[PDB]
């Protein structure tokens, strides 16, 4: 039974959030960083935090981890989603021809505006 209690897990999640650039994939160099960026009465807890910070870093290299918020990663990935195609997708469907079923065309014919130009049956 070697579960990291919530005190170790919360503190190791705080360290990764604040010192992600300084951390690494090894326990011993990370434990050195934990030694001076943390205040704790116990060396054992600092040892368990260093073990779980390294576990978080190995998890972060494979993908995003719930409970960790890194602003540099978030903004960089947000800019990726902000990019738009040269032409709109709804336009491309219209220029390619909108296909409707029988019931939809009956409703369109009953409309005051009539059937739109680039709309055909299926």
């Amino acid at each position: 039974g070697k579960i990291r209690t919530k005190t170790v897990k919360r503190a190791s999640r705080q360290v990764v959030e604040k010192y992600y650039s300084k951390l690494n994939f090894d326990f011993y160099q990370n434990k050195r960083v934990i030694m001076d960026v943390t205040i704790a009465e116990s060396k054992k807890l600092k040892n368990k935090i260093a073990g779980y910070t390294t576990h978080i870093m190995k998890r972060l290299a494979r993908g995003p981890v719930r409970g960790i918020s890194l602003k540099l990663q978030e903004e960089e990935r947000e800019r990726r989603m902000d990019h738009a195609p040269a032409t709109s997708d709804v336009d491309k469907v219209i220029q390619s021809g909108v296909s409707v079923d029988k019931k939809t065309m009956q409703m369109l014919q009953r409309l005051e505006i009539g059937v739109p130009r680039r709309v055909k049956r299926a």
Partner: protein, 211 residues
Amino acid sequence: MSAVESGSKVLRMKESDAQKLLAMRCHIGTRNQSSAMKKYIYGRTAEGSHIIDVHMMWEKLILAARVIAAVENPKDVCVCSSRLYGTRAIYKFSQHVGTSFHGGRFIPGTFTNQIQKKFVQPRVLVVTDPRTDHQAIREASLVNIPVIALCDTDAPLEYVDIAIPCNNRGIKSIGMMYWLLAREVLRLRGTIVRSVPWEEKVDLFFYRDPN
């Protein structure tokens, strides 16, 4: 709500608006009918899928827009979503219209727990689906908050006041209904003109895989 006091036809659905609705399949139901949404259904296709009236969809869409545009101070109109398919839509809608939003799990007590430190008191609530956003609608029933909801053919209409009959399942359909709603609210203000088409693309309203 296309009818105005002067009798002008300015808010009525044009041919461009109908094309956008038809391309994104916003008129497609769920084959499962509901008593509250029976009126909004024009008919049933041969394969069983229900077809949403487009006049009734547009009348309800403008009514919601005129209600949202009537809120002098934004950010007390909350746009909630739980499907994760409308999470980017409500984020983009809030970017232009200027409203509050919350995607993902609705934390219970957000509208009722006054000491939560994450406690908000909106004036209007907008949700993507009454069934999946039942938590937000339930709290709004305790604090006098009207609800505007994008409702499908099988939606339950308890505690929702303005129901937009729409296809709130597909990625492209949800993006268009929030794009059309955002465009109309901006048009109802002085932000953009009706003649010039909107420069913002509906693709920014679509949901993207996190990968």
